[PDB]
Amino acid sequence: MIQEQTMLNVADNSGARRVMCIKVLGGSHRRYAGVGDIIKITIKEAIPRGKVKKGDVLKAVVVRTKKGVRRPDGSVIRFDGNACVLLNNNSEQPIGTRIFGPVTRELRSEKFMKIISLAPEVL
Amino acid sequence: MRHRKSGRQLNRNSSHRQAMFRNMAGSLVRHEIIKTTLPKAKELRRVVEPLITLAKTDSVANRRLAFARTRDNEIVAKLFNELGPRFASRAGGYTRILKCGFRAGDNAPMAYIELVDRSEKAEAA
Amino acid sequence: SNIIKQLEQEQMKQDVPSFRPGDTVEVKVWVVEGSKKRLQAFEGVVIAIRNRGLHSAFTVRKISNGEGVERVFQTHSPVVDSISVKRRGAVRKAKLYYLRERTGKAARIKERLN
Amino acid sequence: AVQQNKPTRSKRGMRRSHDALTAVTSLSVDKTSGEKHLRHHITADGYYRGRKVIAK
Amino acid sequence: MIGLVGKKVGMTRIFTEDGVSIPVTVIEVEANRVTQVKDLANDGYRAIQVTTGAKKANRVTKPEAGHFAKAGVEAGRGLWEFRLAEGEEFTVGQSISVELFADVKKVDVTGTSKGKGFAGTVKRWNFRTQDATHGNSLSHRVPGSIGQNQTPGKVFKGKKMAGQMGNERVTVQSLDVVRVDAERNLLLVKGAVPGATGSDLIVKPAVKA
RNA sequence: GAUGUCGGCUCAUCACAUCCUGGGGCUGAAGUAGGUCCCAAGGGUAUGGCUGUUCGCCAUUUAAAGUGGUACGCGAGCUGGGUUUAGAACGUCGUGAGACAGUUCGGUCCCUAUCUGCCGUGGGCGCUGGAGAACUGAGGGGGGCUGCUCCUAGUACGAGAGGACCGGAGUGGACGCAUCACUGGUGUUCGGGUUGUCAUGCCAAUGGCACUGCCCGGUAGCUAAAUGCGGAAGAGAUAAGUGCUGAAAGCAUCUAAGCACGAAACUUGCCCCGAGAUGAGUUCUCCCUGACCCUUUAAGGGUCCUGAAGGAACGUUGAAGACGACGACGUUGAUAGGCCGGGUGUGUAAGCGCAGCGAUGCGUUGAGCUAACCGGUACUAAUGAACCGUGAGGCUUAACCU
RNA sequence: AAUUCCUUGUCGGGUAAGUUCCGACCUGCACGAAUGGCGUAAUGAUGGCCAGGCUGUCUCCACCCGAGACUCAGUGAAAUU
RNA sequence: CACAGGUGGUCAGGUAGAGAAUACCAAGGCGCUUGAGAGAACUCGGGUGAAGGAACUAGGCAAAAUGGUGCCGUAACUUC
RNA sequence: AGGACCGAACCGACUAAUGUUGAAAAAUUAGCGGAUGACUUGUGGCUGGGGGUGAAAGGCCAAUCAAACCGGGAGAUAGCU
Ligand SMILES: Nc1nc2[nH]cnc2c(=O)[nH]1
Ligand SMILES: [Mg+2]
Ligand SMILES: [Mg+2]
Ligand SMILES: [Mg+2]
Ligand SMILES: [Mg+2]
Ligand SMILES: [Mg+2]
Ligand SMILES: [Mg+2]
Ligand SMILES: [Mg+2]
Ligand SMILES: [Mg+2]
Ligand SMILES: [Mg+2]
Ligand SMILES: [Mg+2]
Ligand SMILES: [Mg+2]
Ligand SMILES: [Mg+2]
Ligand SMILES: [Mg+2]
Ligand SMILES: [Mg+2]
Ligand SMILES: [Mg+2]
Ligand SMILES: [Mg+2]
Ligand SMILES: [Mg+2]
Ligand SMILES: [Mg+2]
Ligand SMILES: [Mg+2]
Numbered sequence A: 001m002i003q004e005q006t007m008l009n010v011a012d013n014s015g016a017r018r019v020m021c022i023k024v025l026g027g028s029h030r031r032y033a034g035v036g037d038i039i040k041i042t043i044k045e046a047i048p049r050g051k052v053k054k055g056d057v058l059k060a061v062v063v064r065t066k067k068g069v070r071r072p073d074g075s076v077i078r079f080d081g082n083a084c085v086l087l088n089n090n091s092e093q094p095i096g097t098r099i100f101g102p103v104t105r106e107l108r109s110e111k112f113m114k115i116i117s118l119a120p121e122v123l
Numbered sequence B: 001m002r003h004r005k006s007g008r009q010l011n012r013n014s015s016h017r018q019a020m021f022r023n024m025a026g027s028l029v030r031h032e033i034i035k036t037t038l039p040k041a042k043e044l045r046r047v048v049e050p051l052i053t054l055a056k057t058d059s060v061a062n063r064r065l066a067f068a069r070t071r072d073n074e075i076v077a078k079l080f081n082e083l084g085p086r087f088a089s090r091a092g093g094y095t096r097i098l099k100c101g102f103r104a105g106d107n108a109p110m111a112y113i114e115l116v117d118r119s120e121k122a123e124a125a
Numbered sequence C: 001s002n003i004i005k006q007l008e009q010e011q012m013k014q015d016v017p018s019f020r021p022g023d024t025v026e027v028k029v030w031v032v033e034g035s036k037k038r039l040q041a042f043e044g045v046v047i048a049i050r051n052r053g054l055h056s057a058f059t060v061r062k063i064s065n066g067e068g069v070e071r072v073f074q075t076h077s078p079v080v081d082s083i084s085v086k087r088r089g090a091v092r093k094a095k096l097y098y099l100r101e102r103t104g105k106a107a108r109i110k111e112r113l114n
Numbered sequence D: 001a002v003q004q005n006k007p008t009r010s011k012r013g014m015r016r017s018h019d020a021l022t023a024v025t026s027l028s029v030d031k032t033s034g035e036k037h038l039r040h041h042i043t044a045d046g047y048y049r050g051r052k053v054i055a056k
Numbered sequence E: 001m002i003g004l005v006g007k008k009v010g011m012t013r014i015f016t017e018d019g020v021s022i023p024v025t026v027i028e029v030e031a032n033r034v035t036q037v038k039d040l041a042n043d044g045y046r047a048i049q050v051t052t053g054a055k056k057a058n059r060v061t062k063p064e065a066g067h068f069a070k071a072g073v074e075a076g077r078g079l080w081e082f083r084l085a086e087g088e089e090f091t092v093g094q095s096i097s098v099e100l101f102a103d104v105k106k107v108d109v110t111g112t113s114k115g116k117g118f119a120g121t122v123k124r125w126n127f128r129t130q131d132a133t134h135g136n137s138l139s140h141r142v143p144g145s146i147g148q149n150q151t152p153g154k155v156f157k158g159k160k161m162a163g164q165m166g167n168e169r170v171t172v173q174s175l176d177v178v179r180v181d182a183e184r185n186l187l188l189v190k191g192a193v194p195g196a197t198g199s200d201l202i203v204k205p206a207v208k209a
Numbered sequence F: 001g002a003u004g005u006c007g008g009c010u011c012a013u014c015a016c017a018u019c020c021u022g023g024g025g026c027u028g029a030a031g032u033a034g035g036u037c038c039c040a041a042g043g044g045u046a047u048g049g050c051u052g053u054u055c056g057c058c059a060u061u062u063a064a065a066g067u068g069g070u071a072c073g074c075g076a077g078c079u080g081g082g083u084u085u086a087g088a089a090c091g092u093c094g095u096g097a098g099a100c101a102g103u104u105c106g107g108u109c110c111c112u113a114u115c116u117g118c119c120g121u122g123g124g125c126g127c128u129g130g131a132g133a134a135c136u137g138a139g140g141g142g143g144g145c146u147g148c149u150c151c152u153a154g155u156a157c158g159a160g161a162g163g164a165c166c167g168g169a170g171u172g173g174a175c176g177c178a179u180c181a182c183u184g185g186u187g188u189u190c191g192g193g194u195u196g197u198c199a200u201g202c203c204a205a206u207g208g209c210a211c212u213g214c215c216c217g218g219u220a221g222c223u224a225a226a227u228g229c230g231g232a233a234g235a236g237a238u239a240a241g242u243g244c245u246g247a248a249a250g251c252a253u254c255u256a257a258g259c260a261c262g263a264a265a266c267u268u269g270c271c272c273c274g275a276g277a278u279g280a281g282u283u284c285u286c287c288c289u290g291a292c293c294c295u296u297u298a299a300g301g302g303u304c305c306u307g308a309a310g311g312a313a314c315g316u317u318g319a320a321g322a323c324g325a326c327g328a329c330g331u332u333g334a335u336a337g338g339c340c341g342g343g344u345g346u347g348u349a350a351g352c353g354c355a356g357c358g359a360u361g362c363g364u365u366g367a368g369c370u371a372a373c374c375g376g377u378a379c380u381a382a383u384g385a386a387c388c389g390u391g392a393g394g395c396u397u398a399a400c401c402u
Numbered sequence G: 001a002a003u004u005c006c007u008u009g010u011c012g013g014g015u016a017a018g019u020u021c022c023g024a025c026c027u028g029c030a031c032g033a034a035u036g037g038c039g040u041a042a043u044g045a046u047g048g049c050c051a052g053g054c055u056g057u058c059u060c061c062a063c064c065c066g067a068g069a070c071u072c073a074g075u076g077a078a079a080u081u
Numbered sequence H: 001c002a003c004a005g006g007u008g009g010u011c012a013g014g015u016a017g018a019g020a021a022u023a024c025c026a027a028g029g030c031g032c033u034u035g036a037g038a039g040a041a042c043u044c045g046g047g048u049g050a051a052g053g054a055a056c057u058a059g060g061c062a063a064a065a066u067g068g069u070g071c072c073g074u075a076a077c078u079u080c
Numbered sequence I: 001a002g003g004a005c006c007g008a009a010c011c012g013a014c015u016a017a018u019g020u021u022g023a024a025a026a027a028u029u030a031g032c033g034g035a036u037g038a039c040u041u042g043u044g045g046c047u048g049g050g051g052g053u054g055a056a057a058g059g060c061c062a063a064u065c066a067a068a069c070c071g072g073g074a075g076a077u078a079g080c081u
């Protein structure tokens, strides 16, 4: 359940450490972002020589949330923190080359295919 | 709303309501019959009637349990010693509510609440 | 309520092993790995049990790649294949929600030898 | 918020149309005491449904 | 097609072979006995009047009793009418079972919503509350302004204001029919239906797509 | 002899000079995308940074971020930041008191709703003898939004780059309703831990008070973040528009006669209310089958006897509720409480025994206790009765029947 | 700038975005030396601005405990007209 | 006004406490001169809140938060 | 040692909510400032109306002070309603 001002940890090697969600994309008045929804982010904390720098405005796919995903049987999967993966502004593809932490099978879609392969664990 | 909620507030907070029902459940056990307002009378049944269900089995635990519920050894005595074995056979409903009139100074609808099988000899002395 | 209990027990599992909070369970679950149907394991501490007949559930916490991951299993779901107690846990409380703020060494649960 | 005109006596009389009381028609008499009492109520001498239930 | 009067037993679930939880509402649909057939010649329209379950003989009034008598059926909790499609025919006394929905894909369920009693604009109309602080004075849940000024110098009819909420006729449309069980006087439908447990419902085949 | 000012908030309502979506003519319209105009008001029409700002600039969304009216809508609805009081300062002006339509810091927002209006909800009477149901549907309200992807098709089109119409499937956003099975929140009435202190003689157990003392969990319920469902398809008559046949006017001409089409607008269709629809409708069932007196003799007044169906009362009550109303039950009875069994929740009570110097541990013991819950149970309470409502119901005419 | 009208001056900083803030420039409408100038540690329920923490301030409300509001009995006002 | 206001000096029990704070008590003194029900909106006053954490707002107003003793340790600047 | 620090009594009154026909003609509640000093307080005394007193706000001088209250000139005058 990500919104404007929600801070997220980064689940990749894009160089960003802390990003803030500045807009929930995908429709007028759209309130929240969930696992697999695209957000517009601003970098607040970044590593010295990574692919991205502090202040850079770009996109991101949410991969883990504290609210988590539901399954057809009612089964929930909750994560301890909200984390996203950085995306190229126009290409909507991963900026990093490596994915850290577990991700859900919800991601399995053609545009997030890269993320589930690289991913260490898929729930 | 109030959907399926049980228990009157009687314009009192939790601690007060509790202590009032502890004293009242005492007064009934002692005098075997008391006069009170009908809503209080009807609620008193939910307090006193299970105290007797306890008193049906004499035990150190049950006695302490009823003690923590009454806070009067005189009452816990009368329960386990008398009433328990008096209502030994009876499957609930140890009290009776008789609607009487209306109180003067405030027009409250009154009632008597008595122990089903009353002892006029324990009530006077 | 009488009809409902009738509809529920006919859908209810009979083989559920006994586990309680603290116990470390290994839930074998049915999943579709793209174009395959296999069993995946989820071995973690049982931090909560909801007993509700058909509606019975339980919460299993694991620390996958530094981060905590809880899963809420609906016990009578066909998804859930097997449940297996890997270690018998020793705790007092029925909900180990305090554990969510404990890490590694603080989060350890004693073995229940009995 | 107060009035702008004095409401009339007819209007007062009107508002009071549902103010009339209802005579108790529920009085019964006890088969033993020969006592008037309300329905589902003990008599002044403590009788109810023929039996002397209260010694007062 | 005609409908059947039922009773809300309550909500539960159904686990599919492909491990999905279907949220269902158990509907007890006992037999519906016809008590009157209305025709164009006598009533001016074609419909069937039905009854279901039972009613305490002492609680059945002389007018009701006789109405049932004419049909030659035992008194039920009430009577409900279903308009007849051109062609649909039934006799008085003819008993209808839940198996009417045996091949009906979706149904529309008409119930009587649970009563919330007197509800404020916030609950009743989803009004946004004013500020909780920042000098707000005794105006947190209040409806705010209820009109304009000299023009029009009245409140327009239909103004959303606090009043009685719930406890009213409500229809839920296009619900998937999960199971039909004649022997068990049952109907299973996907999703929630109006009303509390034990209230009366009306199942009719889906009017829309 | 007072019509409170800007802006915000809350809540709106109308116009259309239309922002989006819909229909269409031209295009300096290949496609995609634009430009311009015509029709169209059904619904929809951002969140932030900055400033009191409206506005505006900017950031990032969106199908879009419409233009106006409504005392520049809305303070007996809220705010009080802007702006006119009284304090003080700077610049400037004045010898001065003081001044600014220059800036700056601080600076009391009352009103229990009589009438109208509006949201709910009752009482009365009526609808022509009374009464219980179920309807009919005149009328009124609600609703009406749209993104993306996939198929057709990488096709038409194009030099490529790119990239469709028509039609079909899927999935979202926003909004609305209902529900509590699920995930959860709450749950001062359930269970546990614990701090200080006081009490039950004391130990042991417990209770009171300290925000529920402080906390950990949690039943029923209520509930959103939870999970179902909705917008429609169809029909009709059209708008701008496109046409067929066709004179006036040998030709031409959508038009004058005749004819075919044509939109989120309109009427239906879907949802709710709905016969006080006084134009008071219909259908089915039920109930009542005594005399007398008086006068101004008539739809007259009164008396005796009668008291139906039904309604109501009173009681136990309800996922119904401010009250009223509405539903369930009242002994030929599960309506409420109690009681029994189960569930659930809490997490191994008390007492005793063993181990240890002890704090404490272990066994008995998944113990003990367990609200609103499920399945049962007449144990307590729902008493025989009263009251309102009557006694066959107008005239005229027609059609049957005598 | 408690002083600058033009004016949100210009530049640099901070932010995704900053009519406020900080640094700088000087074109000071209309700074300036006890009507004191310009600094200054400490002090301040003083004014502006930023950050961490914190949260119902807000997204967007939910549920609960109390005192009213509602019903019964007793007493019994007011502005206004 | 039998009015939540105002009014100088004296006394200082117990446990906990640094204390005349505060919490529970003693002696002593009181339950405040309308009650009974009910458990709607709304107002006052409190308790808890999933995910988010100033996005609120003129302004973090108001909340929430911090909070004790001992020891370690503590920057610019400075009138030391 | 100190117009030193933290903090009850005591003296103040910065913020908010309530209250605004109030419990109250200025309060209550939660927070706030001072708390060995230019501190605070009891009793009694002096200063009187163009007068007092004022760490200065035209503040205060017996619930409305750019000139107190009472009585008088007095039926001031009112081209005003
Ligand atoms: N007391 C009583 N019991 C009933 N049982 C059924 N109807 C009634 C009634 O009208 N009164
Ligand atoms: Mg009261
Ligand atoms: Mg207490
Ligand atoms: Mg019906
Ligand atoms: Mg209700
Ligand atoms: Mg708001
Ligand atoms: Mg106020
Ligand atoms: Mg308030
Ligand atoms: Mg107004
Ligand atoms: Mg008018
Ligand atoms: Mg006037
Ligand atoms: Mg137009
Ligand atoms: Mg043009
Ligand atoms: Mg519009
Ligand atoms: Mg645009
Ligand atoms: Mg205006
Ligand atoms: Mg006001
Ligand atoms: Mg001044
Ligand atoms: Mg100005
Ligand atoms: Mg009609």
Ligand SMILES: [Mg+2]
Residues within 6 Å of the ligand: none
């Ligand atoms: Mg208890």
Ligand SMILES: [Mg+2]
Residues within 6 Å of the ligand: none
């Ligand atoms: Mg002890």
Ligand SMILES: [Mg+2]
Residues within 6 Å of the ligand: F274
């Ligand atoms: Mg109707």
Ligand SMILES: [Mg+2]
Residues within 6 Å of the ligand: F348
């Ligand atoms: Mg043990």
Ligand SMILES: [Mg+2]
Residues within 6 Å of the ligand: none
């Ligand atoms: Mg039990």
Ligand SMILES: [Mg+2]
Residues within 6 Å of the ligand: F391
């Ligand atoms: Mg007669």
Ligand SMILES: [Mg+2]
Residues within 6 Å of the ligand: none
């Ligand atoms: Mg900011």
Ligand SMILES: [Mg+2]
Residues within 6 Å of the ligand: none
């Ligand atoms: Mg500067």
Ligand SMILES: [Mg+2]
Residues within 6 Å of the ligand: none
């Ligand atoms: Mg000072």
Ligand SMILES: [Mg+2]
Residues within 6 Å of the ligand: H002
């Ligand atoms: Mg008094």
Ligand SMILES: [Mg+2]
Residues within 6 Å of the ligand: none
């Ligand atoms: Mg004290």
Ligand SMILES: [Mg+2]
Residues within 6 Å of the ligand: H049
């Ligand atoms: Mg929260």
Ligand SMILES: [Mg+2]
Residues within 6 Å of the ligand: none
């Ligand atoms: Mg949380």
Ligand SMILES: [Mg+2]
Residues within 6 Å of the ligand: H053
């Ligand atoms: Mg945080």
Ligand SMILES: [Mg+2]
Residues within 6 Å of the ligand: none
């Ligand atoms: Mg802001």
Ligand SMILES: [Mg+2]
Residues within 6 Å of the ligand: none
């Ligand atoms: Mg804002």
